Amino acid sequence: MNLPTAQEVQGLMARYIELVDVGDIEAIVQMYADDATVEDPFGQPPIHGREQIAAFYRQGLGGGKVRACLTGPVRASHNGCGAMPFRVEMVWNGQPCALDVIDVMRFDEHGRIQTMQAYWSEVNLSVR
Amino acid sequence: MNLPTAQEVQGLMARYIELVDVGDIEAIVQMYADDATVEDPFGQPPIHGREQIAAFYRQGLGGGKVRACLTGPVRASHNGCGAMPFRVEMVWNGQPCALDVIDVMRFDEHGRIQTMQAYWSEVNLSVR
Numbered sequence: 001m002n003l004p005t006a007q008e009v010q011g012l013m014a015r016y017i018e019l020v021d022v023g024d025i026e027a028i029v030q031m032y033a034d035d036a037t038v039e040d041p042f043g044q045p046p047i048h049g050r051e052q053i054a055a056f057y058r059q060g061l062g063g064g065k066v067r068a069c070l071t072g073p074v075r076a077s078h079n080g081c082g083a084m085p086f087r088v089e090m091v092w093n094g095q096p097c098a099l100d101v102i103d104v105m106r107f108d109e110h111g112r113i114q115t116m117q118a119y120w121s122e123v124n125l126s127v128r
Numbered sequence: 129m130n131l132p133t134a135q136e137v138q139g140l141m142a143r144y145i146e147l148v149d150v151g152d153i154e155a156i157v158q159m160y161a162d163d164a165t166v167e168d169p170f171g172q173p174p175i176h177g178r179e180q181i182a183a184f185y186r187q188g189l190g191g192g193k194v195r196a197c198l199t200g201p202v203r204a205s206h207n208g209c210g211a212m213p214f215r216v217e218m219v220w221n222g223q224p225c226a227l228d229v230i231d232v233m234r235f236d237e238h239g240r241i242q243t244m245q246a247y248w249s250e251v252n253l254s255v256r
């Protein structure tokens with residue numbers, strides 16, 4: 001793939017959420033460029049490269065207990081970038097919880113994620 | 129105000145949408161810091177200069193018949209940044225239209241907007 005068009009960004013970012021939802025860490029990591037950076041949550045030190053990104057997603061998704069779904073359309077640019085709102089359902093203190101997140105992504109000319117920023121904090125964590 | 133807490137970011141970004149929806153251009157521009165940049169849509173060159181930002185908002189909102197509402201919660205960081213999904217309603221090509229947008233904002237140590245990035249493209253335009 002080339003630098004993704006706006007429509008292609010919409011497709012790639014939706015697929016990323018599907019991979020999070022099923023917990024396919026290997027497929028998530030393969031969507032990232034080999035030297036990609038992740039900031040999650042934004043404000044925390046960036047994570048660099050597929051080895052470190054895989055380890056990160058393994059800790060976050062490896063334990064099971066995680067679902068994710070878009071809560072609105074992917075917003076896409078003409079320069080291979082986009083932003084999406086979604087909700088992660090997981091377990092907090094032994095009960096279900098929901099976390100509202102926005103991921104911002106920049107794709108490279110091979111259609112892989114070069115940078116990702118995940119905007120959320122504890123103000124976005126809700127419980128029953 | 130100092131660097132907005134996550135909670136203050138939620139309030140400021142919601143306030144920004146409230147001002148867009150009412151259409152008070154001078155109130156919107158006052159939210160910006162002196163060296164603020166606007167990238168809207170993201171992928172276009174940044175606008176700088178308080179007068180250029182006012183002219184930008186006048187061109188977009190001048191008609192008075194634009195509405196704007198959050199379509200999900202503000203996601204707020206602990207470094208004075210956040211991201212929010214919203215929908216704009218307006219008239220274009222003689223049609224009532226909607227546009228889905230995500231704004232990413234960074235605030236300075238005074239609570240003013242330092243950087244504004246509006247993610248959207250024509251794929252996010254719909255006819256109502």
Ligand SMILES: C[C@]12CC[C@H]3[C@@H](CC[C@H]4CC(=O)CC[C@@H]43)[C@@H]1CC[C@@H]2O
Pocket residue numbers: 148168187188189194216218227229231246248
């Ligand atoms: C110009 C416009 C009305 C105002 C919208 C703008 C899209 C971006 C958002 C970003 C904001 O944060 C403010 C509103 C602004 C629209 C694109 C076409 C339509 O005519």
